[PDB]
Amino acid sequence: ARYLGPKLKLSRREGTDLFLKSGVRAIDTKCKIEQAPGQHGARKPRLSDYGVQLREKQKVRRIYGVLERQFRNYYKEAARLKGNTGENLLALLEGRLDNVVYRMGFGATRAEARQLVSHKAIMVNGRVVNIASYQVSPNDVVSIREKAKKQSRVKAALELAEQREKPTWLEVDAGKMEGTFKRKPERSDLSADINEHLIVELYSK
Amino acid sequence: MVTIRLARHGAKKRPFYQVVVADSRNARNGRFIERVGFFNPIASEKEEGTRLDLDRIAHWVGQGATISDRVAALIKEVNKAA
Amino acid sequence: ELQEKLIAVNRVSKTVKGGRIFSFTALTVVGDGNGRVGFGYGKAREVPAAIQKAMEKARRNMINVALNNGTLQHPVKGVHTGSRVFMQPASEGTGIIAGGAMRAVLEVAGVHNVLAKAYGSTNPINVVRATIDGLENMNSPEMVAAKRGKSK
Amino acid sequence: IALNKRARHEYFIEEEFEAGLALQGWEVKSLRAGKANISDSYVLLRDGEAFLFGANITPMAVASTHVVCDPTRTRKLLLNQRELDSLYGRVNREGYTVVALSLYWKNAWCKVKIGVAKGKKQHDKRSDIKEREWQVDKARIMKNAH
Amino acid sequence: ATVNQLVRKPRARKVAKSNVPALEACPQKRGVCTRVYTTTPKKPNSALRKVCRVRLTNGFEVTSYIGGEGHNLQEHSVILIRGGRVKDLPGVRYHTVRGALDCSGVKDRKQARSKYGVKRPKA
Amino acid sequence: SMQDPIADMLTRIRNGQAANKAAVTMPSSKLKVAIANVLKEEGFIEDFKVEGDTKPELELTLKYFQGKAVVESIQRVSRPGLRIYKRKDELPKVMAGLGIAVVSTSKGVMTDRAARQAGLGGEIICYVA
RNA sequence: AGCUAGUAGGUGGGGUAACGGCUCACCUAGGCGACGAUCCCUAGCUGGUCUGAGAGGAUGACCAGCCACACUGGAACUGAG
RNA sequence: CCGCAGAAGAAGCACCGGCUAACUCCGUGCCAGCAGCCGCGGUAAUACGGAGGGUGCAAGCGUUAAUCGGAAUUACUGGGCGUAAAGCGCACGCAGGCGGUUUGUUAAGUCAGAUGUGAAAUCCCCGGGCUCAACCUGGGAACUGCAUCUGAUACUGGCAAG
Numbered sequence A: 001a002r003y004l005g006p007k008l009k010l011s012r013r014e015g016t017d018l019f020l021k022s023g024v025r026a027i028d029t030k031c032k033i034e035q036a037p038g039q040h041g042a043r044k045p046r047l048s049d050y051g052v053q054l055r056e057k058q059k060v061r062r063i064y065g066v067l068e069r070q071f072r073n074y075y076k077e078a079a080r081l082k083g084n085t086g087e088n089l090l091a092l093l094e095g096r097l098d099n100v101v102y103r104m105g106f107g108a109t110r111a112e113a114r115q116l117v118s119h120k121a122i123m124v125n126g127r128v129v130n131i132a133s134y135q136v137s138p139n140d141v142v143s144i145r146e147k148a149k150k151q152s153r154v155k156a157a158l159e160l161a162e163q164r165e166k167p168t169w170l171e172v173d174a175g176k177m178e179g180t181f182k183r184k185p186e187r188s189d190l191s192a193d194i195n196e197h198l199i200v201e202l203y204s205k
Numbered sequence B: 001m002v003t004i005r006l007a008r009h010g011a012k013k014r015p016f017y018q019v020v021v022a023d024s025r026n027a028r029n030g031r032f033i034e035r036v037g038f039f040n041p042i043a044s045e046k047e048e049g050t051r052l053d054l055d056r057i058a059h060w061v062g063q064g065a066t067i068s069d070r071v072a073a074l075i076k077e078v079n080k081a082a
Numbered sequence C: 001e002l003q004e005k006l007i008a009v010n011r012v013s014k015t016v017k018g019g020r021i022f023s024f025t026a027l028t029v030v031g032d033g034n035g036r037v038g039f040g041y042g043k044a045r046e047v048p049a050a051i052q053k054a055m056e057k058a059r060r061n062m063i064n065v066a067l068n069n070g071t072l073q074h075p076v077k078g079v080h081t082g083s084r085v086f087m088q089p090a091s092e093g094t095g096i097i098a099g100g101a102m103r104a105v106l107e108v109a110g111v112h113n114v115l116a117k118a119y120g121s122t123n124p125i126n127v128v129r130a131t132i133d134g135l136e137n138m139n140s141p142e143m144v145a146a147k148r149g150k151s152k
Numbered sequence D: 001i002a003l004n005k006r007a008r009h010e011y012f013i014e015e016e017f018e019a020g021l022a023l024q025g026w027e028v029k030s031l032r033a034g035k036a037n038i039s040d041s042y043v044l045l046r047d048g049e050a051f052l053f054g055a056n057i058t059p060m061a062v063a064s065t066h067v068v069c070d071p072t073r074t075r076k077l078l079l080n081q082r083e084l085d086s087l088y089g090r091v092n093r094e095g096y097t098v099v100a101l102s103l104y105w106k107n108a109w110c111k112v113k114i115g116v117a118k119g120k121k122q123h124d125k126r127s128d129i130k131e132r133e134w135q136v137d138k139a140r141i142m143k144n145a146h
Numbered sequence E: 001a002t003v004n005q006l007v008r009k010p011r012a013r014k015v016a017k018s019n020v021p022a023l024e025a026c027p028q029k030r031g032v033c034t035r036v037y038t039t040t041p042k043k044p045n046s047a048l049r050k051v052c053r054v055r056l057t058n059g060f061e062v063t064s065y066i067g068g069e070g071h072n073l074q075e076h077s078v079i080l081i082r083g084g085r086v087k088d089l090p091g092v093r094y095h096t097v098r099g100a101l102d103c104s105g106v107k108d109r110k111q112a113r114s115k116y117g118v119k120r121p122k123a
Numbered sequence F: 001s002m003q004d005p006i007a008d009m010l011t012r013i014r015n016g017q018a019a020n021k022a023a024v025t026m027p028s029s030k031l032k033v034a035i036a037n038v039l040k041e042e043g044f045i046e047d048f049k050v051e052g053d054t055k056p057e058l059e060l061t062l063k064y065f066q067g068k069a070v071v072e073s074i075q076r077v078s079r080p081g082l083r084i085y086k087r088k089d090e091l092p093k094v095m096a097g098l099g100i101a102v103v104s105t106s107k108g109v110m111t112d113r114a115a116r117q118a119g120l121g122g123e124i125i126c127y128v129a
Numbered sequence G: 001a002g003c004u005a006g007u008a009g010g011u012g013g014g015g016u017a018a019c020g021g022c023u024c025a026c027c028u029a030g031g032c033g034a035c036g037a038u039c040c041c042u043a044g045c046u047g048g049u050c051u052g053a054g055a056g057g058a059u060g061a062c063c064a065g066c067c068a069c070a071c072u073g074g075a076a077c078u079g080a081g
Numbered sequence H: 001c002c003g004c005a006g007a008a009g010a011a012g013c014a015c016c017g018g019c020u021a022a023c024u025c026c027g028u029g030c031c032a033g034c035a036g037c038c039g040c041g042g043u044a045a046u047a048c049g050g051a052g053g054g055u056g057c058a059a060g061c062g063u064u065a066a067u068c069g070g071a072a073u074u075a076c077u078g079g080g081c082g083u084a085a086a087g088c089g090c091a092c093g094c095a096g097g098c099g100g101u102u103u104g105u106u107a108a109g110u111c112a113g114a115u116g117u118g119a120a121a122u123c124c125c126c127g128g129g130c131u132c133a134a135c136c137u138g139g140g141a142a143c144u145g146c147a148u149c150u151g152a153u154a155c156u157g158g159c160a161a162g
């Protein structure tokens, strides 16, 4: 059950650079976007504790498209594994196939990448998959089948892909719609817009 | 009587057979004596899925374990002694 | 940089002849992250004045700690009026587990990983004082070595 | 006697008279036995000579297993013309509020023994209001926590 | 506290009675209300409360509070009790599941429909 | 009455530390002098001397690195009311290796680290830190 | 808070596919019990499951081993069982 | 798996005064009514009923039923007994519990090494197959237990001497 509904209000509920819609139509602070000025605009009640942690969990979940139960399963797997629980959780979240497509550029938005993955616009190692929860291993290759080539869907996504920067672990060619995933990311390369140990504290509670 | 036979333990529509030495008075899923190995029907025939212990099979046959049709068929499928 | 944070604020009464004089009391802690933990109680007629006085009191009488890289070098037990605190080194563990009136003080002390539990009456002031006393009574391996003839 | 223990412990009754009231067959035939709930009947001003309010109907098993008989039904007090405007004026500028007290019987009519009681003042909440204000201040002052 | 005393008589745990003894570890019970009436409440919440005494299948008669505004309950009614006590009513520790073979939902109620039996309307 | 000499010795040591006494005297025994030796190996005290023949008296001198006492905590473990025995590797380490859990093993009296290095076990006399 | 006299044991017979009061005749008057005998209530047990950092607490859902049962009760035969 | 028209055929529940994530209006006016607690509701209810709007989970949401945890609130690890519950009114004493100092001897308690065993199943670790998962499965460890053979003699204890 992928989330569906308003997105600008969803983003302004927290107020961050979570991510935006792929199309842009006057995306700026025209009059009221996230910190609405004029006669009102109370943005933060400033809750004492566990509230910022809940907000971080919610923004993480809505960015990645994952539900609460699956996110908690991922957290439990990360805690069971070695290393740091937060980075292991972020590694699993990025290894989710939909985020791989989004960061490779074939998905204009993360929701669009999930839609494509469901509609079988993606293949891994020469095999179709219709699960946005698949975990990719290092040193792998993920291709796009010939049917998804003729999609203005994908053309716009690949056009918008090259306006951003590029990651440490993905190398994608659009002459064949194929991307090699070499290594796994880390907190250094990941955006520093959230805290992981607060989330760890919350579900360890 | 003591015999070597196959017991089913896999999930629905994906069976899994274990070859084992068990007295005939017990059931298929019932108790046994000594495990011998497994034979996967689907077998995922890129990797393994067929592992029998011919030494234990021979030792129990020497003591009186009656070979079953499926065990003999699996032996003929893999090899007499290889 | 001074890592200041209060814990709880409560109002008191005097029950004077003319009625009740509702004053306010605070509770604040201060630190940097490498020891130097201080606390302040603070009383006043208003909440902002009380918390300011608590912060000012916490600024002085600041006692340092002999912490390890991110924790204590040994388990410790602190005892006070009606509160008992147990601290365990808890290596790695991607953070602390401490609860109210105690997670604030160690996050102020800067120790990220520690197993902290409180047995007894959960009075914030008393548990904070017990934690401070336990940290003070804690000793470093270098100190105990120089005291006892290390030979390790 | 249906003394209305609430109106007995608070604001003793001062004035009353004898009159019946109008009702249908559903909410009747049990007041003949005596069962009723007439504790602190909130009788207010109605254009029809202050129609009976407040008191509900007895919970006796006369129900059609849907409702008792009438969760809210019109009940009419009885006065030719003596207390409509006078009752309005008394409630407005005197402090006397007429409430129903008892249910006496002429063996046929369930009489509304309405009593004109004085409006008694509330207990001094000047401690709990400050307690609530302190509670909301405590809830709001939790801002400086990260 | 002495180890010898503990050995000679082990330290035992204190039994704890269940708050709903008449249920006997069962989620709900069925009975018919022997009487349905209203009971005067305690000091602070003088609001009138509706109760019924119902004799269950286990041979015990218990009093159960009725929630909602307006009750579709009477005597000789096959009811369902779920458990739960009200601190405002003396000696009352049961609740009635409105909407079990002899009760309807709260009239003109559009919120908490699941908790008060009413199904979600089409419009 | 006198049900444990070791507990009495520990209590006298703790009382001397509390009162800032320089030397504490008591009756002596083989177990007492063994415990004194195992403590002096780690230097929790200055020195122990036993004098007299008819009435052997052991006197131990307390170390003082500063105003604070060198030994802060000392607790009897294997009391007559409850004996304590641990495995080869399951001996307790007080304060994660800061202090000694004195243990009498098959070879004799030693500390926790010595017992772990020798690969045996015994009874835990007392924790000292 | 006492129970038990086929009950404790021995001497021989019979009986059991085998030991044995399993049973018979005799003799010895012991045996068990404050570490709970005898009696009352409850209960299938175990591997395990849940909850727990741990010691612990609850329970025996699915599956496996064992026990007992087949309207209630008693009895025997066939059959190696 | 390949083709077929169109998003065309598929979202609800609970909560929104503090515990805990979420604020405004209308009406009733200790009444009707909510609730686990604190506690609300006596004309202005973010708490009641409705409406608007927000939050938490989502083909599942809430109530109830049972266990543990938080309860260190049966505490052996890990409580206390002068005034909160708790030193028998006092003394003698058996079974019982513990026991001053030294030597020798026994190996009982204790410690070490080795063996068999702790059914399989299940937890866990390394891998594999079902579109990943749920699920199944290979190997390994663990199942801290139990008994046996040989040593250790510091401690407790059996025996012999003081």
Ligand SMILES: [Mg+2]
Pocket: none
């Ligand atoms: Mg015989």
Ligand SMILES: [Mg+2]
Pocket: G043
């Ligand atoms: Mg039974």
Ligand SMILES: [Mg+2]
Pocket: H069
């Ligand atoms: Mg616990």
Ligand SMILES: [Mg+2]
Pocket: none
């Ligand atoms: Mg407990």
Ligand SMILES: [Mg+2]
Pocket: H079, H080
């Ligand atoms: Mg206590």
Ligand SMILES: [Mg+2]
Pocket: none
């Ligand atoms: Mg007393």
Ligand SMILES: [Mg+2]
Pocket: none
């Ligand atoms: Mg006395």
Ligand SMILES: [Mg+2]
Pocket: none
């Ligand atoms: Mg007395």
